[PDB]
């Protein structure tokens, strides 16, 4: 016990708290905005308003609904168990919120630069259907049941393909981590993105992360046509909320991890032409070069935002049978097949 | 440090998996405590690397491996396990004393 | 300072760095960007739409 | 006999009683030649042996320190007290600079335990 | 150090729900009844407690799963040391996923895959 | 290149107990869906556990495959029982138990008392030469990586026969 | 890269990598074409097994080497162990492709999983690392798993994996955790010749941690070879699975369980020889006391043979526990080559009896001289192999086994072993007594409606190229110890 190094660990705490504490702000305030988002984009392509009077343009409706949920009664079911049933959406909840923790906004404005990297988010986004099973068998209900039921065939039928894209992309960048791979892109600039040289596997990466985050043609666990809520059924109160930001946060997590594997990150630059703006927006260094780079992965981010919010909309949504073999069938064969490619492909370069 | 702890921990697993391997009345729960036994094994040699092994991480590999072969287990039974409740429409193994 | 960290800038330039991009995010470019969202709100094409929620 | 590291380290951290001042001195002898011996193993930057090291060492010195004041005479019991102080700011220093690993300022932080250990050393006599 | 952050991030990410669950607690009322309590089964009142029990053919999928995410996990350090080492990698993963797919094309033939 | 000296004690003590209470409920509930969740608990503190020894890729591998595997055993443990059956609860105790559960005690306590009479630490004092990594492998991944690549090729294609042999065993004694 | 180093290391495995062809081409054809013919398939798994062969003989000669850094030991000792399983899985391949076609199940699945089984059994035979010695009996224990609950309809079967499943979990875990403990407590080493090193260089050789680590790798290893109260798995699986993988697991699976004792006890365990030689007489002496004894008692065949082969292992056991300098693996040698004739013989009748019968219990093989004399002839020539009687190869082997055994002062085992063998005479000569019954009313109708065909059929030239062994070997045993002392 030195009471030298005591305090200067004690002050070195709180200075990792302190990205802790504002990358939450800003993912409840994420989570926020693709509420609103999603609503206003829903509202514009069936030319209605969307959410007009929460605010002044409805800016204040997720807060609304969000405070609203804290407001409202817990409702637990007296036939089903009550550990499961509160253990459940908190389990989703860790595990997808735990994927944050690698992803790069800057090229050192990451919160932990673990060399495991990708490895860890597929691991720790492989536990949340076991809490959805788990909700689903502690509500004692036959929506819940079949609702946790499809969640945990979904998972396992759109696991494997996410894996093996990601697996590409590790190849062609020769590391797990995020920072390794957005630099190996930012070699080459715009054109060296793996989005031109891994098209299948962007592809593929894109429905299995539209899986995994449940959203429609791949909702079949909430399903609200077939099951009333699904495994929501019986939910009510703040786990509900849960059971919403762990969505929403999954659909953000996707579209970042989109926008850092198979678009360039933070960076944009063509070296191959004379653009003058794209030279001197990588000229900038410092704190403005930080914030563009921010700017820039969030508009990256934004862009596979809009297009699942607008296929949720717009599609219909799939039979069990049809997830099935869409996962199993035409997906697997096909990132095994462009796995093989990378593969042939990078023999070239050693 | 108490690493040491972690030794006690895997023993203790491997006693409770053992115990649960025996008075197990569902053989989905012998499966699991099979693989809590593989766990504490696993736990050992793990830790054994840390202590020994910084370089080249034998006990790694072979904790890979032990996890490999117990996911090949569990995908061999339950498909045992749907055999056995396809002829019996029974799980309960204490029951099944025939060959005696 | 320690071993890991090279050039890192003085603080009071990055705390003035730091303090217009907070001046020019919070409370400059909001204003200006609801008013482009309240004005403009039905004058939106596809392309406008996009960017309007983009910002 | 040897006294003490016979045993697996939580059953003699645990279960058992404790030095004697005369068993401590040995004990504060033997973590310093342990120390001078370290360098190799420092200059190979393999931190996780060095941070072992310095756990286990720390946890032995934080008894034998205290238990080791009685050999001290009284004339130099609240200099050596001083300097076991200093000894504890300099490990802890070392500890900071093998976790979270730096070369310059764990072998900085090295010396510095050493001259420490050495003044410790030099009280105890 | 780079996973201190982690533990601390973990602890914040299992707190969080911790105190959803206490200011839901201390904010919302408790109106229980009798009713309430029911389970939800679309107005009716619901027949035995839930249970489904599938068929075996079409949960087979999960027998292929177990086996294919280990066979995942197996190919992520050869990618990791492609580059240091040469063709020898190549050849000793090419096994690999060519046992991988005539695995794949034994579950479709044999009509564990089909639902 | 670890934790603090307390945190790390604190959580080694913390995940030691999660674990405990997690083997308790596998090996003390009737339900197999309540042990196999109690068995869920196991397997992240296990993966915690290899995380704070220095097992970063192994932590991710027992994640996904035990994962993966628990998900399984839950789906036919589900499809493979009676009804729910929340009223089981905590099966009875029998004779047939009480017996084991000394053989068991028996066989922990000669399992710890040579535990804590080995002096762990005096290995790793004379294992020097093991703990010499080369410095040009700066990533953990990339030294299993390599190792499983070279030092361990005969197992990694027996590996790949078995898993093959397994999938189509399973799929062959499971089908109607 | 050079894809060299391994390519010249892969050379030498390479009758393994001629059995992961046959078994790929095998599965791939299986696959791809609708249709399924007995014959290719025939052809297949034979021309598999006797091209291992045919390159095992050819690397005979060469010099030992450890290949795959530290990974397979190639020498004379587990050359010999593994044309053995060769030997059993080519005389045990006819013996299933009729069993598994009159059960009107698939096939090829059979034959892939005793290709693997196989393939299995070869790499635990050199396996000069501890993760090789814990995968590759890995790929014969998972595979017997598949096997022995292949029936799949047998309400016996399921049982027997059951039984199978959860006792083979309970060992090779036991063993894992031996192999942790040998590993933790030397210094992360796990090549074979490489741990006492390692242990010496942290002087733990006498640490209290290495004598659990024997104990957990000799009851992992004696279940698998089923000596003494290890032996519980064994009946009920010979009881309630079918014939020819219950040959199979009889023969095959105490070959590869020897070679890893032989290569567990002698190169990473000399320095402790005097715990588990006094282990290994427990371990032999209530085998042949506790697999003599009750099955004498048995009314079933298959279970009876299944207390023979838990009997007969003690026997093999006395020349681990002799050592090298007293003969001693030269005779485990000479005597498992003559075991795998006796065993497969005596299961061929078995097969044949119960496809043309339908039974498996002792009462229902009275009268089998005067329907088939030529079958009678051969189960009892088989049987009294089996029990050490002169002119046949067991007597040979046995007093073979116990010259070692008397020149090395263990006087205690080789009377407990001739006690034993005069009690293994009873058994061996009731089903004999039986088969010799001319009495009509206790004939079973069973075999009073036997047909036995004007076909020769597959298992009666597989059991004539044993039948004609275990008789006429008995002057060629001169032969084959200078094969086996040769190895060191
Ligand atoms: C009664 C049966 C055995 C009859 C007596 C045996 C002696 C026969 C001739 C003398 C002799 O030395 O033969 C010697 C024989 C030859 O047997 C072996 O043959 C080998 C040839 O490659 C080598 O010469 C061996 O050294 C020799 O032992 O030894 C026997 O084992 C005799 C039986 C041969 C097999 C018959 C079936
Ligand atoms: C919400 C999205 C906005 C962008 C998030 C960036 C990530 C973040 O907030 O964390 C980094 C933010 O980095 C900063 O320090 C920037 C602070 C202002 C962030 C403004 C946004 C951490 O990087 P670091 O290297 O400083 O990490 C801590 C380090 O190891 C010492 O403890
Ligand atoms: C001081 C904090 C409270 C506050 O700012 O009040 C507002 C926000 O407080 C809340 O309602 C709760 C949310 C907290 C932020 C409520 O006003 P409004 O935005 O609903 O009305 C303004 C206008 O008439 C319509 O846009
Ligand atoms: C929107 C918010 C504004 C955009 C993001 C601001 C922060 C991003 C730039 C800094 C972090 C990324 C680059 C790392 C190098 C760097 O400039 O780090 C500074 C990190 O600056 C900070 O500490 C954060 C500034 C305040 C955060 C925003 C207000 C240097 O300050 P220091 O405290 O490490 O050293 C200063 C002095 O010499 C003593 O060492
Ligand atoms: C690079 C990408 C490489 C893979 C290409 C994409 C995947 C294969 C495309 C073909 C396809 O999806 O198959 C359809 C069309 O496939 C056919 O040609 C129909 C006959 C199927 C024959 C039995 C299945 C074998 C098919 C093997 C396909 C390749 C296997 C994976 C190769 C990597 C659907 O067939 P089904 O599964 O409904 O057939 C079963 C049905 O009962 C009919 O038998
Ligand atoms: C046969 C099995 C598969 C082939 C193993 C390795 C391929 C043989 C050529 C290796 C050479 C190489 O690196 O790939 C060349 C590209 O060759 C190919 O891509 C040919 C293979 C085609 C398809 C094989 C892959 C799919 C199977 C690139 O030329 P280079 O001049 O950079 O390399 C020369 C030197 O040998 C480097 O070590
Ligand atoms: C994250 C871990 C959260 C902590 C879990 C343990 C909570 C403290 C012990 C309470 C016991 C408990 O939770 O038991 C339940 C079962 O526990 C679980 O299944 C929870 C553990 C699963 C954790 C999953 C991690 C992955 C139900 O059994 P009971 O006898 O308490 O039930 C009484 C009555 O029927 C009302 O329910
Ligand atoms: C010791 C050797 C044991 C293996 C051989 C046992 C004898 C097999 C035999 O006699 O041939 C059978 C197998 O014959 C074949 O059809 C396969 C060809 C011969 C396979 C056996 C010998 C192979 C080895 C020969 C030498 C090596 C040849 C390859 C290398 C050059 C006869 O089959 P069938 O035509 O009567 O079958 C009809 C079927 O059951 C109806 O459903
Ligand atoms: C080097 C490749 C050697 C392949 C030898 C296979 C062969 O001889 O062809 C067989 C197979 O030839 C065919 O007619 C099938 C088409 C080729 C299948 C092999 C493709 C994968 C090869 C690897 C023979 O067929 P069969 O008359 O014995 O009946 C087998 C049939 O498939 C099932 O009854
Ligand atoms: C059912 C088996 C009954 C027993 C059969 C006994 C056979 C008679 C006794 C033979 C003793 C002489 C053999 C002693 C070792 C010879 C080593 C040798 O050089 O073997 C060569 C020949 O290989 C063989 O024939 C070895 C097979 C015999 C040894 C193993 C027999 C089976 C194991 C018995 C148990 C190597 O093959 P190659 O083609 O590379 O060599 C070319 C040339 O011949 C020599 O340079
Ligand atoms: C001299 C010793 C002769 C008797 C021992 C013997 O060799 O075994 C059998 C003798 O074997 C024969 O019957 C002879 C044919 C096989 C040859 C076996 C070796 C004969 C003696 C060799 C020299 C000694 C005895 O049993 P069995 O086969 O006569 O049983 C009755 C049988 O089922 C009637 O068919
Ligand atoms: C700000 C941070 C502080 C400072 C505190 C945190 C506050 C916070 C951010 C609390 C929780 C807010 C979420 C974040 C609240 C719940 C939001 C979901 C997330 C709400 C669900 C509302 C539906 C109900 C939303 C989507 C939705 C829109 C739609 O149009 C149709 C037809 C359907 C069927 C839908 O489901």
Same mark, same amino acid.
């Given at each position: 016990?030195?009471?030298?190094?005591?305090?200067?660990?004690?002050?070195?705490?709180?200075?990792?708290?302190?990205?802790?504490?504002?990358?939450?702000?800003?993912?409840?305030?994420?989570?926020?905005?693709?509420?609103?988002?999603?609503?206003?984009?829903?509202?514009?392509?069936?030319?209605?308003?969307?959410?007009?009077?929460?605010?002044?343009?409805?800016?204040?409706?997720?807060?609304?609904?969000?405070?609203?949920?804290?407001?409202?009664?817990?409702?637990?079911?007296?036939?089903?168990?009550?550990?499961?049933?509160?253990?459940?959406?908190?389990?989703?909840?860790?595990?997808?919120?735990?994927?944050?923790?690698?992803?790069?906004?800057?090229?050192?404005?990451?919160?932990?630069?673990?060399?495991?990297?990708?490895?860890?988010?597929?691991?720790?986004?492989?536990?949340?259907?076991?809490?959805?099973?788990?909700?689903?068998?502690?509500?004692?209900?036959?929506?819940?049941?079949?609702?946790?039921?499809?969640?945990?065939?979904?998972?396992?039928?759109?696991?494997?393909?996410?894996?093996?894209?990601?697996?590409?992309?590790?190849?062609?960048?020769?590391?797990?981590?995020?920072?390794?791979?957005?630099?190996?892109?930012?070699?080459?600039?715009?054109?060296?993105?793996?989005?031109?040289?891994?098209?299948?596997?962007?592809?593929?990466?894109?429905?299995?992360?539209?899986?995994?985050?449940?959203?429609?043609?791949?909702?079949?666990?909430?399903?609200?046509?077939?099951?009333?809520?699904?495994?929501?059924?019986?939910?009510?109160?703040?786990?509900?909320?849960?059971?919403?930001?762990?969505?929403?946060?999954?659909?953000?997590?996707?579209?970042?991890?989109?926008?850092?594997?198979?678009?360039?990150?933070?960076?944009?630059?063509?070296?191959?032409?004379?653009?003058?703006?794209?030279?001197?927006?990588?000229?900038?260094?410092?704190?403005?070069?930080?914030?563009?780079?921010?700017?820039?992965?969030?508009?990256?981010?934004?862009?596979?935002?809009?297009?699942?919010?607008?296929?949720?909309?717009?599609?219909?949504?799939?039979?069990?049978?049809?997830?099935?073999?869409?996962?199993?069938?035409?997906?697997?064969?096909?990132?095994?097949?462009?796995?093989?490619?990378?593969?042939?492909?990078?023999?070239?370069?050693? | 440090?108490?690493?040491?702890?972690?030794?006690?921990?895997?023993?203790?697993?491997?006693?409770?998996?053992?115990?649960?391997?025996?008075?197990?009345?569902?053989?989905?729960?012998?499966?699991?405590?099979?693989?809590?036994?593989?766990?504490?094994?696993?736990?050992?040699?793990?830790?054994?690397?840390?202590?020994?092994?910084?370089?080249?991480?034998?006990?790694?590999?072979?904790?890979?491996?032990?996890?490999?072969?117990?996911?090949?287990?569990?995908?061999?039974?339950?498909?045992?396990?749907?055999?056995?409740?396809?002829?019996?429409?029974?799980?309960?193994?204490?029951?099944?004393?025939?060959?005696? | 300072?320690?071993?890991?960290?090279?050039?890192?800038?003085?603080?009071?330039?990055?705390?003035?760095?730091?303090?217009?991009?907070?001046?020019?995010?919070?409370?400059?470019?909001?204003?200006?960007?609801?008013?482009?969202?309240?004005?403009?709100?039905?004058?939106?094409?596809?392309?406008?739409?996009?960017?309007?929620?983009?910002? | 006999?040897?006294?003490?590291?016979?045993?697996?380290?939580?059953?003699?951290?645990?279960?058992?009683?404790?030095?004697?001042?005369?068993?401590?001195?040995?004990?504060?002898?033997?973590?310093?030649?342990?120390?001078?011996?370290?360098?190799?193993?420092?200059?190979?930057?393999?931190?996780?042996?060095?941070?072992?090291?310095?756990?286990?060492?720390?946890?032995?010195?934080?008894?034998?320190?205290?238990?080791?004041?009685?050999?001290?005479?009284?004339?130099?019991?609240?200099?050596?007290?001083?300097?076991?102080?200093?000894?504890?700011?300099?490990?802890?220093?070392?500890?900071?600079?093998?976790?979270?690993?730096?070369?310059?300022?764990?072998?900085?932080?090295?010396?510095?335990?050493?001259?420490?250990?050495?003044?410790?050393?030099?009280?105890?006599? | 150090?780079?996973?201190?952050?982690?533990?601390?991030?973990?602890? =914040? $990410?299992?707190?969080?729900?911790? *105190?959803?669950?206490?200011? &839901? @607690? %201390?904010?919302?009322? =408790? $109106?229980?009844?009798?009713?309430? *309590?029911?389970?939800?089964? &679309? @107005? %009716?009142?619901?027949?035995?407690?839930?249970?489904?029990?599938?068929?075996?053919?079409?949960?087979?999928?999960?027998?292929?799963?177990?086996?294919?995410?280990?066979?995942?996990?197996?190919?992520?350090?050869?990618?990791?040391?492609?580059?240091?080492?040469?063709?020898?990698?190549?050849?000793?993963?090419?096994?690999?996923?060519?046992?991988?797919?005539?695995?794949?094309?034994?579950?479709?033939?044999?009509?564990?895959?089909?639902? | 290149?670890?934790?603090?000296?307390?945190?790390?004690?604190?959580?080694?003590?913390?995940?030691?107990?999660?674990?405990?209470?997690?083997?308790?409920?596998?090996?003390?509930?009737?339900?197999?869906?309540?042990?196999?969740?109690?068995?869920?608990?196991?397997?992240?503190?296990?993966?915690?556990?290899?995380?704070?020894?220095?097992?970063?890729?192994?932590?991710?591998?027992?994640?996904?495959?035990?994962?993966?595997?628990?998900?399984?055993?839950?789906?036919?443990?589900?499809?493979?029982?009676?009804?729910?059956?929340?009223?089981?609860?905590?099966?009875?105790?029998?004779?047939?138990?009480?017996?084991?559960?000394?053989?068991?005690?028996?066989?922990?306590?000669?399992?710890?008392?040579?535990?804590?009479?080995?002096?762990?630490?005096?290995?790793?004092?004379?294992?020097?030469?093991?703990?010499?990594?080369?410095?040009?492998?700066?990533?953990?991944?990339?030294?299993?990586?390599?190792?499983?690549?070279?030092?361990?090729?005969?197992?990694?294609?027996?590996?790949?026969?078995?898993?093959?042999?397994?999938?189509?065993?399973?799929?062959?004694?499971?089908?109607? | 890269?050079?894809?060299?180093?391994?390519?010249?290391?892969?050379?030498?495995?390479?009758?393994?990598?001629?059995?992961?062809?046959?078994?790929?081409?095998?599965?791939?054809?299986?696959?791809?074409?609708?249709?399924?013919?007995?014959?290719?398939?025939?052809?297949?798994?034979?021309?598999?097994?006797?091209?291992?062969?045919?390159?095992?003989?050819?690397?005979?000669?060469?010099?030992?080497?450890?290949?795959?850094?530290?990974?397979?030991?190639?020498?004379?000792?587990?050359?010999?162990?593994?044309?053995?399983?060769?030997?059993?899985?080519?005389?045990?391949?006819?013996?299933?492709?009729?069993?598994?076609?009159?059960?009107?199940?698939?096939?090829?699945?059979?034959?892939?999983?005793?290709?693997?089984?196989?393939?299995?059994?070869?790499?635990?035979?050199?396996?000069?690392?501890?993760?090789?010695?814990?995968?590759?009996?890995?790929?014969?224990?998972?595979?017997?798993?598949?096997?022995?609950?292949?029936?799949?309809?047998?309400?016996?079967?399921?049982?027997?994996?059951?039984?199978?499943?959860?006792?083979?979990?309970?060992?090779?875990?036991?063993?894992?955790?031996?192999?942790?403990?040998?590993?933790?407590?030397?210094?992360?080493?796990?090549?074979?010749?490489?741990?006492?090193?390692?242990?010496?260089?942290?002087?733990?050789?006498?640490?209290?941690?290495?004598?659990?680590?024997?104990?957990?790798?000799?009851?992992?290893?004696?279940?698998?070879?089923?000596?003494?109260?290890?032996?519980?798995?064994?009946?009920?699986?010979?009881?309630?699975?079918?014939?020819?993988?219950?040959?199979?697991?009889?023969?095959?699976?105490?070959?590869?369980?020897?070679?890893?004792?032989?290569?567990?006890?002698?190169?990473?365990?000399?320095?402790?020889?005097?715990?588990?030689?006094?282990?290994?007489?427990?371990?032999?002496?209530?085998?042949?006391?506790?697999?003599?004894?009750?099955?004498?008692?048995?009314?079933?065949?298959?279970?009876?043979?299944?207390?023979?082969?838990?009997?007969?292992?003690?026997?093999?056991?006395?020349?681990?526990?002799?050592?090298?300098?007293?003969?001693?693996?030269?005779?485990?040698?000479?005597?498992?080559?003559?075991?795998?004739?006796?065993?497969?013989?005596?299961?061929?009748?078995?097969?044949?009896?119960?496809?043309?019968?339908?039974?498996?219990?002792?009462?229902?093989?009275?009268?089998?001289?005067?329907?088939?004399?030529?079958?009678?002839?051969?189960?009892?020539?088989?049987?009294?192999?089996?029990?050490?009687?002169?002119?046949?190869?067991?007597?040979?082997?046995?007093?073979?086994?116990?010259?070692?055994?008397?020149?090395?002062?263990?006087?205690?085992?080789?009377?407990?072993?001739?006690?034993?063998?005069?009690?293994?005479?009873?058994?061996?000569?009731?089903?004999?007594?039986?088969?010799?019954?001319?009495?009509?009313?206790?004939?079973?109708?069973?075999?009073?409606?036997?047909?036995?065909?004007?076909?020769?059929?597959?298992?009666?030239?597989?059991?004539?190229?044993?039948?004609?062994?275990?008789?006429?070997?008995?002057?060629?045993?001169?032969?084959?110890?200078?094969?086996?002392?040769?190895?060191?």
């Amino acid at each position: 016990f030195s009471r030298l190094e005591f305090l200067k660990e004690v002050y070195e705490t709180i200075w990792m708290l302190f990205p802790i504490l504002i990358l939450v702000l800003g993912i409840t305030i994420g989570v926020l905005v693709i509420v609103w988002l999603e609503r206003e984009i829903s509202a514009s392509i069936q030319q209605r308003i969307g959410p007009e009077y929460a605010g002044p343009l409805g800016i204040l409706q997720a807060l609304a609904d969000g405070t609203k949920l804290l407001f409202k009664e817990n409702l637990l079911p007296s036939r089903g168990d009550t550990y499961l049933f509160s253990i459940g959406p908190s389990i989703a909840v860790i595990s997808i919120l735990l994927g944050y923790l690698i992803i790069p906004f800057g090229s050192r404005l990451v919160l932990a630069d673990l060399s495991i990297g990708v490895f860890l988010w597929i691991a720790v986004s492989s536990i949340a259907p076991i809490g959805l099973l788990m909700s689903g068998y502690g509500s004692n209900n036959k929506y819940s049941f079949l609702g946790g039921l499809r969640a945990a065939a979904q998972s396992i039928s759109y696991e494997i393909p996410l894996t093996l894209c990601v697996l590409s992309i590790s190849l062609l960048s020769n590391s797990s981590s995020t920072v390794d791979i957005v630099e190996a892109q930012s070699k080459y600039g715009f054109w060296g993105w793996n989005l031109w040289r891994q098209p299948i596997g962007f592809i593929v990466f894109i429905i299995s992360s539209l899986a995994e985050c449940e959203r429609l043609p791949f909702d079949l666990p909430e399903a609200e046509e077939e099951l009333v809520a699904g495994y929501q059924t019986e939910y009510s109160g703040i786990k509900f909320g849960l059971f919403y930001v762990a969505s929403y946060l999954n659909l953000l997590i996707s579209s970042l991890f989109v926008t850092v594997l198979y678009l360039g990150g933070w960076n944009l630059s063509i070296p191959y032409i004379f653009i003058s703006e794209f030279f001197e927006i990588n000229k900038i260094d410092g704190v403005f070069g930080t914030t563009i780079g921010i700017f820039i992965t969030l508009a990256k981010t934004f862009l596979f935002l809009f297009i699942p919010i607008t296929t949720r909309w717009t599609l219909p949504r799939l039979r069990m049978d049809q997830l099935l073999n869409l996962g199993w069938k035409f997906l697997l064969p096909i990132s095994l097949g462009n796995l093989l490619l990378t593969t042939s492909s990078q023999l070239f370069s050693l | 440090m108490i690493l040491e702890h972690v030794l006690v921990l895997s023993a203790f697993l491997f006693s409770i998996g053992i115990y649960g391997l025996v008075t197990s009345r569902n053989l989905v729960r012998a499966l699991m405590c099979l693989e809590l036994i593989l766990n504490a094994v696993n736990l050992n040699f793990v830790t054994f690397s840390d202590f020994f092994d910084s370089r080249q991480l034998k006990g790694n590999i072979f904790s890979i491996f032990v996890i490999a072969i117990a996911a090949a287990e569990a995908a061999i039974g339950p498909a045992i396990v749907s055999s056995i409740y396809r002829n019996r429409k029974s799980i309960r193994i204490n029951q099944s004393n025939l060959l005696n | 300072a320690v071993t890991g960290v090279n050039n890192q800038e003085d603080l009071i330039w990055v705390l003035l760095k730091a303090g217009v991009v907070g001046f020019c995010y919070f409370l400059i470019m909001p204003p200006i960007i609801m008013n482009w969202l309240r004005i403009r709100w039905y004058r939106r094409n596809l392309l406008e739409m996009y960017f309007q929620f983009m910002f | 006999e040897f006294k003490w590291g016979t045993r697996s380290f939580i059953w003699e951290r645990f279960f058992e009683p404790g030095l004697s001042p005369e068993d401590a001195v040995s004990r504060i002898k033997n973590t310093a030649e342990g120390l001078h011996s370290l360098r190799h193993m420092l200059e190979t930057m393999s931190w996780r042996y060095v941070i072992f090291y310095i756990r286990l060492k720390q946890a032995y010195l934080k008894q034998d320190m205290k238990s080791a004041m009685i050999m001290v005479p009284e004339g130099r019991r609240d200099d050596y007290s001083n300097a076991a102080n200093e000894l504890v700011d300099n490990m802890a220093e070392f500890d900071y600079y093998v976790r979270t690993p730096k070369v310059y300022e764990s072998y900085v932080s090295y010396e510095k335990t050493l001259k420490s250990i050495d003044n410790l050393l030099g009280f105890l006599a | 150090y780079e996973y201190d952050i982690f533990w601390a991030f973990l602890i =914040i $990410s299992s707190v969080i729900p911790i *105190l959803a669950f206490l200011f &839901s @607690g %201390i904010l919302a009322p =408790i $109106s229980k009844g009798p009713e309430k *309590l029911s389970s939800y089964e &679309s @107005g %009716i009142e619901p027949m035995g407690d839930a249970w489904l029990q599938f068929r075996i053919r079409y949960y087979m999928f999960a027998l292929v799963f177990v086996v294919f995410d280990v066979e995942t996990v197996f190919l992520y350090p050869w990618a990791m040391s492609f580059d240091i080492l040469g063709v020898s990698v190549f050849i000793e993963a090419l096994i690999f996923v060519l046992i991988l797919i005539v695995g794949l094309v034994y579950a479709w033939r044999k009509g564990a895959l089909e639902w | 290149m670890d934790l603090p000296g307390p945190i790390h004690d604190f959580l080694l003590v913390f995940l030691g107990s999660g674990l405990i209470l997690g083997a308790l409920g596998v090996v003390l509930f009737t339900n197999p869906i309540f042990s196999a969740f109690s068995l869920g608990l196991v397997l992240v503190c296990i993966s915690l556990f290899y995380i704070l020894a220095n097992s970063h890729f192994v932590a991710s591998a027992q994640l996904l495959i035990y994962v993966g595997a628990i998900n399984v055993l839950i789906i036919f443990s589900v499809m493979f029982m009676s009804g729910p059956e929340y009223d089981k609860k905590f099966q009875l105790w029998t004779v047939g138990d009480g017996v084991t559960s000394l053989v068991c005690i028996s066989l922990f306590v000669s399992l710890i008392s040579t535990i804590l009479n080995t002096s762990w630490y005096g290995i790793i004092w004379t294992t020097k030469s093991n703990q010499i990594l080369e410095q040009d492998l700066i990533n953990a991944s990339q030294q299993i990586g390599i190792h499983l690549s070279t030092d361990f090729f005969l197992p990694f294609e027996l590996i790949s026969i078995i898993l093959l042999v397994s999938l189509i065993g399973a799929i062959a004694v499971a089908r109607q | 890269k050079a894809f060299h180093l391994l390519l010249f290391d892969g050379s030498l495995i390479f009758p393994e990598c001629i059995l992961i062809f046959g078994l790929i081409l095998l599965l791939m054809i299986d696959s791809t074409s609708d249709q399924k013919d007995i014959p290719w398939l025939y052809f297949i798994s034979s021309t598999s097994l006797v091209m291992s062969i045919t390159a095992l003989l050819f690397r005979w000669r060469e010099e030992p080497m450890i290949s795959f850094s530290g990974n397979f030991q190639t020498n004379n000792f587990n050359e010999i162990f593994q044309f053995l399983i060769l030997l059993c899985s080519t005389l045990c391949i006819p013996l299933s492709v009729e069993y598994i076609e009159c059960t009107e199940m698939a096939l090829t699945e059979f034959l892939l999983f005793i290709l693997t089984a196989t393939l299995g059994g070869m790499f635990l035979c050199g396996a000069n690392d501890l993760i090789t010695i814990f995968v590759a009996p890995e790929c014969f224990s998972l595979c017997s798993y598949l096997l022995s609950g292949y029936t799949k309809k047998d309400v016996r079967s399921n049982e027997a994996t059951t039984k199978y499943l959860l006792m083979g979990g309970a060992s090779s875990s036991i063993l894992v955790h031996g192999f942790s403990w040998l590993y933790g407590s030397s210094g992360g080493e796990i090549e074979l010749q490489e741990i006492v090193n390692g242990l010496i260089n942290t002087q733990m050789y006498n640490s209290p941690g290495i004598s659990i680590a024997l104990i957990f790798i000799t009851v992992g290893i004696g279940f698998k070879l089923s000596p003494a109260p290890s032996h519980q798995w064994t009946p009920d699986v010979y009881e309630g699975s079918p014939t020819p993988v219950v040959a199979f697991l009889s023969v095959t699976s105490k070959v590869a369980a020897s070679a890893s004792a032989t290569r567990i006890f002698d190169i990473p365990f000399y320095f402790s020889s005097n715990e588990w030689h006094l282990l290994l007489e427990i371990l032999a002496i209530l085998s042949m006391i506790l697999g003599n004894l009750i099955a004498i008692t048995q009314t079933s065949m298959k279970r009876m043979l299944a207390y023979s082969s838990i009997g007969q292992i003690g026997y093999v056991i006395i020349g681990i526990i002799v050592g090298d300098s007293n003969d001693g693996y030269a005779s485990m040698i000479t005597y498992m080559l003559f075991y795998i004739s006796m065993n497969l013989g005596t299961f061929a009748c078995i097969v044949l009896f119960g496809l043309r019968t339908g039974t498996d219990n002792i009462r229902d093989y009275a009268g089998l001289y005067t329907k088939d004399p030529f079958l009678a002839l051969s189960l009892a020539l088989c049987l009294l192999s089996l029990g050490g009687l002169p002119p046949l190869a067991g007597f040979f082997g046995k007093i073979y086994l116990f010259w070692c055994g008397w020149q090395a002062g263990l006087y205690f085992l080789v009377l407990i072993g001739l006690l034993t063998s005069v009690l293994s005479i009873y058994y061996y000569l009731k089903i004999i007594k039986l088969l010799m019954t001319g009495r009509n009313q206790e004939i079973t109708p069973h075999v009073r409606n036997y047909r036995r065909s004007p076909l020769r059929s597959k298992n009666s030239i597989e059991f004539s190229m044993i039948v004609c062994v275990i008789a006429s070997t008995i002057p060629g045993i001169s032969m084959n110890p200078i094969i086996t002392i040769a190895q060191d």
